[PDB]
Design a protein around this ligand. Structure first.
Ligand SMILES: *C(=C)C1=C(C)[C@@H](Cc2[nH]c(/C=C3N=C(/C=C4\NC(=O)[C@H](C)[C@H]4CC)C(C)=C\3CCC(=O)O)c(CCC(=O)O)c2C)NC1=O
Ligand SMILES: *[C@@H](C)[C@H]1/C(=C/C2=NC(=C\c3[nH]c(C[C@H]4NC(=O)C(C=C)=C4C)c(C)c3CCC(=O)O)/C(CCC(=O)O)=C2C)NC(=O)[C@@H]1C
Ligand SMILES: *[C@@H](C)[C@H]1/C(=C/C2=NC(=C\c3[nH]c(C[C@H]4NC(=O)C(C=C)=C4C)c(C)c3CCC(=O)O)/C(CCC(=O)O)=C2C)NC(=O)[C@@H]1C
Ligand SMILES: *[C@@H](C)[C@H]1/C(=C/C2=NC(=C\c3[nH]c(C[C@H]4NC(=O)C(C=C)=C4C)c(C)c3CCC(=O)O)/C(CCC(=O)O)=C2C)NC(=O)[C@@H]1C
Ligand SMILES: *[C@H](C)[C@H]1/C(=C/C2=NC(=C\c3[nH]c(C[C@H]4NC(=O)C(C=C)=C4C)c(C)c3CCC(=O)O)/C(CCC(=O)O)=C2C)NC(=O)[C@@H]1C
Ligand SMILES: *[C@H](C)[C@H]1/C(=C/C2=NC(=C\c3[nH]c(C[C@H]4NC(=O)C(C=C)=C4C)c(C)c3CCC(=O)O)/C(CCC(=O)O)=C2C)NC(=O)[C@@H]1C
Ligand SMILES: *[C@H](C)[C@H]1/C(=C/C2=NC(=C\c3[nH]c(C[C@H]4NC(=O)C(C=C)=C4C)c(C)c3CCC(=O)O)/C(CCC(=O)O)=C2C)NC(=O)[C@@H]1C
Ligand SMILES: *[C@H](C)[C@H]1/C(=C/C2=NC(=C\c3[nH]c(C[C@H]4NC(=O)C(C=C)=C4C)c(C)c3CCC(=O)O)/C(CCC(=O)O)=C2C)NC(=O)[C@@H]1C
Ligand SMILES: C=CC1=C(C)[C@@H](Cc2[nH]c(/C=C3N=C(/C=C4\NC(=O)[C@H](C)[C@H]4CC)C(C)=C\3CCC(=O)O)c(CCC(=O)O)c2C)NC1=O
Ligand SMILES: C=CC1=C(C)[C@@H](Cc2[nH]c(/C=C3N=C(/C=C4\NC(=O)[C@H](C)[C@H]4CC)C(C)=C\3CCC(=O)O)c(CCC(=O)O)c2C)NC1=O
Ligand SMILES: C=CC1=C(C)[C@@H](Cc2[nH]c(/C=C3N=C(/C=C4\NC(=O)[C@H](C)[C@H]4CC)C(C)=C\3CCC(=O)O)c(CCC(=O)O)c2C)NC1=O
Ligand SMILES: C=CC1=C(C)[C@@H](Cc2[nH]c(/C=C3N=C(/C=C4\NC(=O)[C@H](C)[C@H]4CC)C(C)=C\3CCC(=O)O)c(CCC(=O)O)c2C)NC1=O
Ligand SMILES: C=CC1=C(C)[C@@H](Cc2[nH]c(/C=C3N=C(/C=C4\NC(=O)[C@H](C)[C@H]4CC)C(C)=C\3CCC(=O)O)c(CCC(=O)O)c2C)NC1=O
Ligand SMILES: CCC1=C(C)/C(=C/C2=NC(=C\c3[nH]c(/C=C4\NC(=O)[C@H](C)[C@H]4CC)c(C)c3CCC(=O)O)/C(CCC(=O)O)=C2C)NC1=O
Lengths: 161, 380, 177, 164, 206, 177, 177
């Protein structure tokens, strides 16, 4: 994993240079918005249970998926349903804090499209469930805090399709 | 009863636009009705004159050296005794029109251009084409322009003050004739000098043949291929810019196809549309788990009513019953929102969407396989 | 056709969503830089009459058979039409820079352009270069580095608008390629 | 759609002119009036489910004949497809406030609605008693600003004018 | 009776083995970028240039790339009068650094598939350092001035390959000039005869 | 195009700097007359959009049954496609002049061309004419003895390069004959 | 459309030459024999009403299956519609004989006549007997070798003009095949 601070240290170190003016400007961009992410990161951790409960019921609850013969039918399949959505919500909160989506490519999108295709999980429905989870999570942290939040929800859906 | 009158009839006295134009592709693009008002400023006599030279010449480009023959009939319009239907009669009878679209054109191509320019209507059936040939051979070019305009069709559609436009009529009298219109107005960036080969057949752009393709579709009643309606078309100039889940756009014909990947695609559409026939039948009765208990759960909940909202004490504590129409049924906001997510959640709609993504890919992979002997191949 | 504001409406419609918290923030930075966009469109419509002769005549000097007899820009009417289609392309790229979205390029500028060039006989290799020279001119006028004309702007960078207009001059340079 | 930008590029392209000086001037008014109507679109995005619920049962409290057998509210499936339609009209008004003009309500919400409500026997007074309720619930300094409440209640009255 | 069954054994199953073959974590059958291109037999010129220029060292890394390799007909289409003026000097055996900057422009970091680019305009930075535009509208995917013909070819380390119909030139690319002979000042008095004096700088002399 | 010569990789982290173990002895010895060779190829690619346009027009006036109705070049799909084939035939010949072998010409253009024309009914006896017209333009443009266009080359001699491209054109006019 | 004089214009312009003393010797003999062309063409128009009934009723007594039920001139509609095209074939070689060139002939008369007859299903061998029976009468009037009707002229060689229109009916048969 590399955050916004480490990503600028990387760009400088590959040239052997100290931190110049263009580098110190990117560092102030992170520090100035830093205590806003720490406030949004605690607000989502407190509403994690309801962000998923309202996203599921609104998106895929009375759908054919929960009826006999579909995916998420058995209780284990339902429990693996809502266990996956909390994985995305918990990792998108790690990315908004670090300001760099590098943690999502190593520990979330690490070949997740092949796993969902083999098992038979509907990729079209999981992308719309994450999207439904973006409209309820955005009404909590506001627009300015939701900008960096929704930036990573679309990263998971784009890296999943 | 959806529509009440077609566009081939005159407008009724209680409407601004016609009814069939209100939900057509007329509202979505540039093919609309430009009307000249009662008293015209000289700046907004250009807005009517640029629209005439768009339509009646079919996106041909009149240079100013050759717009000089039109200043006599331009000024007769700018004065105001030539209406728009009389300006286009003299413009069709001009010399710059007969050089472009008559003096090198086969007689099929000249009639289908006059159907595109004077009317907003590709030629409908064959005996209509035949009777319009059978005036020019007997009466010459002069009276034949009075065939298109001095009938009931021009007065009912354009009147005398609207510039002609490509009509998106709604109701098409053959349904093939919608395809002819899309094959004739084929592109915003196109023009009949290109589509008729009238620049490449001649010398330095002059002396061109205005030869027609799709002649045999007039005589033998045969449909237009779907590529000529979806890739270079008025439907791309009037594109609704929707989200469409079967996206109608024609993908580019790929280089490097192989007969292996066509056979897997051809097989999997037979797996999908056989599954669709056995899933559509399965649905409409036993699809719903909570449906057989609905009459038993509807007879259990029909007592304990609180008219002045705020009853159901359940002890001495208070409960806040609301008497809305939705919440009386026990429903939430997610009860009406589930109808929006039935595209990646329904099993009958997932099959049909996945079927027509595949016949989209199959219609362009098969047609690229119509190429031959010196073809270099690949390893996927 | 669409602009930058309606393009995010039809992508939110594809998810049945309201244009909400994190979806509006990118549009509030489209109007926060909305004056640099108006300052950048004005650079191109100012020098537009000399943008299409710096480019068309710069194509003749590289492929000199275009004016040789039998060539595509040989007579006066064929040369007049090439300058007439040269500025009609720059006219639609200016609408795409103004609207912030390339819908007008797809819906009505390029709707049949590759088909109509083969039907006429326009050489498509040279007509890339007439569009490719205009790309070099337009990023010089937006970053204010034209070597024979300077215009007066406020201080700041327009690096992002110079790359976006570079994206429209090669969507045209690839949809007839 | 119908926006500020699309009207000044389609009137220009009909003439054959570059973006002129009166064109860039009208897009400056898109910058001033922006933050008023981008403030009412965000108030609608985060509070719509409480608006649609309250606007929907105003339709059935006013006309309770709809819940009879034979009418357009006879079971739970048609009632859910009623509150769904209010949430469609409320979502298009949010799309109109973001675009700038009446683009989305014309092509997606009006163009054909006079026909699909006649064959399916949906009463249209029941549609407008839900939209007129929300226009009259707007307490203009509490819900949003005073200039946002103008931009919000403009498309609300544009819709009632189109259905009536 | 269904359409999309679920994999698994035991009770509450459908009759389909886990992962469709009892293989939950399947092994990688795809091969590297450099050898999946040499196998197709149409990226002949492209892969040969990667080996001669030295760019082959980073096309094999594990980093998720999105290559836009040009077909052999694309490299043969450089004989156009215009594009030949820009790249004809890359044939000289000493202009290898200029060839590396023209090749590395086609290696995009990230895995952009043809379906994710549907109706989306994306701008990224190549491995050369310059910004590149990728936008698929109306199912017409074009990378700069490429207009991809063959959409997707999956490769070893989760990388993607697309076949383009042209060669993409970097934005701020200046063609290296032809080799020239050094020129020296013939006379030294003629050097002084072109330098203005202080009198001429003040206007007191011609 | 860019495979016609050899290059020297001089930087570490490349594997061709060290572990190549091999030099292109036939492509390093081929830059011996490479400067004269690139001027012969540039002589053709600067003239290409008139060479094909002259030669296809040069045979219509030599066999006027082609743009006769029913003739193989009457309709518009076929007139453009005959123009495309000359642009491809001439382009492959230039590659062979650049690389100095008929390998890319015999594999990528001539391998599977004789059967194709008699599968399409393409008249070949007028098709070998347009090559033999294009052969005469190539030997004028290389020896710089063309009439109405000359160029500025270094003073020297370009025979043994004009006979070498004289061999590549009747190699086309015999593989399809 | 063209004529015999404009034929040498587009050919000399194609190689960019002045129409000079070489290529004018054919046109100078073309204007000198053009008086005999003027009282050649006047033979055709004076008989053209009678000529088609002399030449389409020879088509229906050389192949009398066409007047049968199911035959392709059975109806009262189709017997007129063959007489409708019995003379339009003559009307566009009268234009081509008076012009000395067939550029107006194969641009309005044979510009998709083959595909029209296939799509209609008009029997394409009786049609050649609707042209050659005109030919045996048209040059019989040009050479004044008609048996029944005679016309007044002045003597001299007239056979190259009978041959120039015998070339203008072979264009009909070689197109609609
Ligand atoms: C019609 C029957 C007819 C023609 C059309 C015309 C075509 C033609 N041209 C040649 C010979 C050459 N053509 C050349 C081409 C060009 N010269 C130029 O400067 C420009 C760039 C280009 C044309 C735009 C050249 C260089 C030659 C060689 C002769 C010379 O020194 O110019 C032929 C064949 C003659 C031959 O191959 O020897 C033809 C048919 N001529 C026609 O007769
Ligand atoms: C990048 C292309 C340029 C550059 C651009 C900047 N322009 C800035 C401000 C600016 N420009 C205008 C005029 C513009 N607005 C309009 O409404 C109209 C016409 C109707 C036009 C032409 C205005 C009004 C402004 C605002 C400042 C002012 O003049 O009062 C600007 C400042 C940043 C910002 O305002 O956000 C920049 C950087 N400057 C450059 O360095 C390159 C060359
Ligand atoms: C409840 C308060 C309403 C009411 C609503 C009903 N609507 C029914 C069907 C229906 N409605 C629409 C229009 C709607 N769909 C859209 O996509 C949009 C905008 C984007 C809108 C406004 C359509 C197209 C349809 C038909 C398809 C469908 O089922 O959605 C409906 C069902 C009627 C029936 O099945 O016969 C009802 C009950 N009914 C009322 O009483 C008030 C007016
Ligand atoms: C072979 C096809 C013919 C034949 C042809 C000859 N015609 C000769 C002379 C000729 N014809 C006309 C009339 C013509 N010119 C017009 O301007 C008009 C209409 C307005 C017409 C019909 C004229 C005027 C002449 C010139 C003699 C005169 O009348 O003063 C001719 C003489 C040779 C020559 O003119 O060089 C020949 C051989 N003659 C035949 O016997 C067969 C039928
Ligand atoms: C309804 C049961 C279908 C369906 C229909 C749609 N049709 C759309 C446009 C359209 N429909 C027709 C068919 C009809 N019109 C005719 O004139 C004739 C014959 C004379 C027939 C059978 C035509 C020809 C057209 C195109 C003409 C036009 O648009 O003006 C349409 C709108 C598509 C759009 O706006 O892009 C729809 C939705 N769609 C369905 O899902 C069900 C299966
Ligand atoms: C110039 C940079 C080119 C070139 C251009 C020529 N174009 C000719 C005709 C022509 N061009 C267009 C393109 C244009 N019209 C549009 O509506 C749009 C998109 C909105 C575009 C880009 C059209 C439609 C036509 C046909 C004109 C007509 O039908 O009258 C042309 C020949 C004109 C003639 O033959 O009279 C030329 C020479 N040629 C070149 O060599 C450079 C590369
Ligand atoms: C052949 C058809 C000509 C001719 C050619 C000669 N060219 C000679 C030298 C030369 N040519 C170039 C340009 C060429 N080299 C490149 O690297 C590129 C593209 C990037 C091109 C087009 C250069 C740079 C040079 C070197 C300058 C010099 O050495 O003077 C040359 C003399 C050297 C040699 O023979 O190898 C000749 C003879 N001369 C002719 O007479 C015909 C017309
Ligand atoms: C032109 C001077 C000829 C002539 C040419 C035609 N060729 C037609 C189609 C065609 N030609 C080729 C060969 C060409 N394509 C290549 O990729 C390569 C090199 C690798 C070459 C030499 C192919 C493969 C095709 C079919 C593909 C296509 O049509 O796009 C053609 C059209 C045939 C038709 O429409 O029936 C023509 C007219 N024909 C002539 O009359 C002159 C002599
Ligand atoms: C053979 C003939 C020939 C030409 C005509 C020019 C044409 C030309 N100009 C530029 C490059 C440019 N061309 C212009 C155009 C103009 N500058 C202005 O200020 C005017 C408004 C307008 C002239 C009317 C501009 C602004 C640039 C960018 C650099 C600059 O001039 O400051 C380029 C791209 C860079 C390059 O390849 O060199 C070309 C090909 N070059 C040629 O070789
Ligand atoms: C999209 C825009 C938007 C709105 C307009 C409101 C609409 C609205 N207002 C209220 C709720 C209220 N609205 C008012 C306001 C008033 N009551 C009066 O008697 C005065 C006339 C008027 C002041 C202007 C009051 C006092 C309440 C609380 C009591 C009540 O619900 O009636 C509620 C109930 C939930 C809540 O408290 O918010 C809703 C949905 N909400 C929205 O999301
Ligand atoms: C399907 C509808 C249909 C018809 C209506 C008839 C009409 C008809 N009659 C004739 C043809 C003829 N018709 C007559 C008829 C007459 N001459 C006279 O002296 C009388 C006045 C008159 C009838 C009593 C003669 C003499 C001919 C021969 C002329 C010829 O063939 O050149 C022809 C030309 C072809 C042919 O000869 O067969 C046709 C189409 N035939 C049809 O197939
Ligand atoms: C501009 C060029 C031009 C022409 C050359 C003519 C030729 C021509 N004839 C017909 C149409 C026809 N052509 C014939 C002709 C014949 N049947 C035979 O047996 C004979 C071989 C031959 C005449 C002797 C017949 C019989 C029809 C009518 C077909 C029918 O009515 O079913 C058509 C189709 C149009 C239509 O049917 O209205 C055309 C183009 N007309 C033109 O406009
Ligand atoms: C089945 C019925 C049937 C016929 C009607 C005739 C029709 C007919 N006439 C001619 C042959 C001819 N036909 C004409 C035409 C005419 N002659 C005139 O004097 C008039 C101006 C015009 C009739 C109105 C001429 C001028 C000749 C040449 C011989 C001559 O008359 O000198 C020919 C070709 C050569 C020949 O046979 O001689 C035919 C087929 N033959 C038949 O088998
Ligand atoms: C930390 C990153 C990470 C992710 C994302 C992850 C996913 C993952 N999802 C799984 C299953 C599953 N995933 C779902 C998911 C869904 N059902 C639906 O209807 C929706 C479309 C979708 C989301 C709600 C279901 C139903 C299963 C159970 C499949 C089975 O038991 O056979 C499994 C198999 C293991 C198990 O049975 O629990 C893994 C490993 N693992 C990880 O390590």
């Amino acid at each position: 994993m590399q955050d916004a601070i480490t990503s600028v240290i990387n760009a400088a170190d590959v040239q052997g240079k100290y931190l110049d003016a263009n580098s110190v400007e990117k560092l102030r961009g992170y520090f100035q918005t830093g205590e806003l992410r720490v406030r949004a990161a605690a607000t989502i951790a407190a509403n994690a249970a309801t962000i998923i409960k309202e996203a599921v019921a609104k998106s895929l609850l009375y759908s054919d998926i929960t009826r006999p013969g579909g995916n998420m039918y058995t209780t284990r399949r339902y429990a693996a349903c809502i266990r996956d959505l909390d994985y995305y919500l918990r990792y998108a909160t790690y990315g908004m804090l670090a300001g760099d989506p590098s943690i999502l490519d190593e520990r979330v999108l690490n070949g997740l499209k092949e796993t969902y295709n083999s098992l038979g999980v509907p990729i079209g429905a999981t992308i719309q469930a994450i999207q439904a989870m973006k409209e309820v999570t955005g009404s909590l942290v506001g627009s300015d805090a939701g900008k960096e939040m929704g930036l990573y929800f679309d990263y998971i859906c784009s890296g999943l399709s | 009863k959806v529509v009440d009158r077609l566009d081939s009839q005159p407008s009724a006295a209680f409407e601004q636009t016609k009814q069939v134009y209100t939900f057509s592709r007329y509202i979505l693009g540039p093919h609309r009705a430009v009307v000249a008002p009662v008293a015209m400023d000289p700046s907004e006599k250009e807005v009517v004159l640029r629209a005439v030279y768009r339509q009646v010449f079919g996106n041909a480009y009149i240079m100013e050296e050759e717009r000089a023959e039109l200043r006599v009939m331009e000024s007769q319009f700018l004065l105001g005794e030539l209406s728009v239907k009389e300006l286009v009669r003299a413009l069709a009878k001009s010399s710059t029109y007969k050089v472009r679209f008559f003096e090198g054109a086969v007689q099929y191509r000249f009639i289908e251009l006059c159907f595109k320019h004077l009317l907003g209507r590709a030629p409908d059936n064959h005996e209509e084409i035949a009777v319009h040939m059978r005036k020019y051979q007997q009466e010459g070019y002069d009276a034949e322009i009075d065939s298109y305009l001095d009938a009931g069709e021009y007065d009912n559609v354009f009147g005398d003050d609207t510039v002609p436009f490509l009509r998106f009529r709604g109701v098409y009298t053959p349904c093939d004739s919608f395809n002819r219109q899309c094959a004739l107005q084929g592109g915003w960036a196109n023009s009949d000098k290109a589509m008729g080969g009238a620049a490449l057949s001649g010398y330095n752009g002059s002396d061109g043949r205005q030869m027609s393709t799709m002649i045999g579709n007039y005589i033998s009643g045969k449909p237009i291929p779907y590529e000529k309606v979806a890739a270079d078309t008025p439907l791309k100039s009037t594109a609704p810019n929707w989200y469409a889940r079967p996206n109608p756009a024609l993908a580019p014909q790929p280089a490097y196809v192989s007969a292996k990947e066509i056979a897997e695609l051809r097989s999997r559409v037979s797996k999908l549309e056989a599954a669709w026939s056995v899933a559509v039948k399965q649905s409409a009765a036993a699809k719903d788990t909570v449906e057989t208990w609905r009459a038993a759960a509807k007879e259990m909940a029909a007592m304990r009513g609180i008219s002045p909202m705020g009853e159901a004490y359940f002890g001495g504590i208070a409960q806040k019953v609301d008497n809305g129409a939705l919440a009386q049924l026990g429903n939430k906001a997610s009860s009406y929102k589930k109808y929006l997510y039935a595209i990646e959640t329904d099993e009958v709609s997932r099959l049909e969407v996945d079927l027509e993504e595949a016949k989209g890919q199959l219609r362009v992979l098969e047609a690229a396989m119509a190429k031959s002997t010196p073809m270099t191949r690949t390893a996927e | 056709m669409l602009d930058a504001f309606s393009r995010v409406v039809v992508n939110s419609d594809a998810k049945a969503a309201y244009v909400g918290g994190s979806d509006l923030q990118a549009l509030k930075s489209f109007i926060a830089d909305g004056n640099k966009r108006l300052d950048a469109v004005n650079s191109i419509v100012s020098n537009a009459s000399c943008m299409v002769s710096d480019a068309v005549s710069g194509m003749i000097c590289e492929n000199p058979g275009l004016i040789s007899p039998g060539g595509n820009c040989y007579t006066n009417r064929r040369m007049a039409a090439c300058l007439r289609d040269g500025e009609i392309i720059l006219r639609y790229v200016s609408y795409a820079l103004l609207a912030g979205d390339a819908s007008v390029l797809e819906d009505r500028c390029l709707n049949g352009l590759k088909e109509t060039y083969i039907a006429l006989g326009v050489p498509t290799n040279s007509s890339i270069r007439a569009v490719s020279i205009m790309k070099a001119q337009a990023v010089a006028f937006i970053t204010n580095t034209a070597t024979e004309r300077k215009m007066s702007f406020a201080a700041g960078d327009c690096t992002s608008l110079a790359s976006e207009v570079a994206s429209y001059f090669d969507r045209v340079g690839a949809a007839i390629s | 759609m119908k926006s500020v930008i699309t009207t000044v590029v389609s009137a220009a392209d009909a003439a054959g002119r570059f973006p002129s000086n009166s064109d860039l001037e009208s897009i400056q008014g898109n910058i001033q009036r922006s933050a008023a109507r981008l403030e009412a679109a965000e108030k609608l995005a985060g509070n719509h489910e409480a608006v649609v619920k309250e606007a929907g049962d105003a339709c059935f409290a006013k006309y309770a004949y709809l819940k009879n057998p034979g009418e357009a509210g006879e079971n739970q499936e048609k009632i859910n497809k009623c509150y769904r339609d209010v949430d469609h009209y409320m979502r298009l008004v949010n799309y109109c406030l973001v675009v700038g003009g009446t683009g989305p309500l014309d092509e997606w919400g009006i163009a054909g609605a006079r026909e699909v409500y006649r064959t399916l026997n949906l009463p249209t007074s029941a549609y407008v008693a839900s939209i007129a309720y929300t226009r009259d619930r707007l307490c203009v300094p509490r819900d949003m600003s005073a200039q946002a409440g103008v931009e919000f209640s403009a498309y609300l009255d544009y819709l009632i004018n189109a259905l009536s | 009776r269904t359409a999309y069954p679920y994999t698994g054994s035991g009770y509450g199953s459908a009759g389909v083995p886990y992962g469709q073959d009892t293989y939950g974590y399947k092994a990688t059958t795809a091969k590297s970028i450099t050898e999946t291109a040499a196998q197709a037999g149409v990226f002949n010129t492209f892969v040969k240039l990667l080996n001669e220029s030295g760019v082959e060292k980073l096309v094999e890394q594990a980093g998720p790339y999105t290559v836009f390799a040009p077909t052999d007909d694309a490299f043969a289409a450089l004989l156009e009068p215009h594009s030949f003026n820009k790249l004809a000097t890359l044939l000289r055996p000493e202009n290898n650094d200029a060839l590396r900057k023209v090749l590395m422009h086609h290696v995009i970091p990230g895995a952009f598939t043809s379906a994710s680019l549907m109706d989306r305009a994306v701008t990224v930075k190549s491995l050369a350092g310059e910004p590149i535009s990728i936008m698929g509208l109306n199912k017409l995917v074009t990378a700069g001035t490429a207009k991809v013909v063959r959409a997707d070819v999956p490769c070893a380390n989760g990388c993607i390959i697309h076949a383009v119909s042209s060669v993409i030139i970097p934005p701020n690319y200046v063609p290296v000039p032809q080799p020239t002979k050094p020129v020296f000042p013939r006379s030294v008095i003629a050097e002084i005869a072109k330098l203005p004096t202080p009198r001429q700088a003040l206007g007191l002399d011609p």
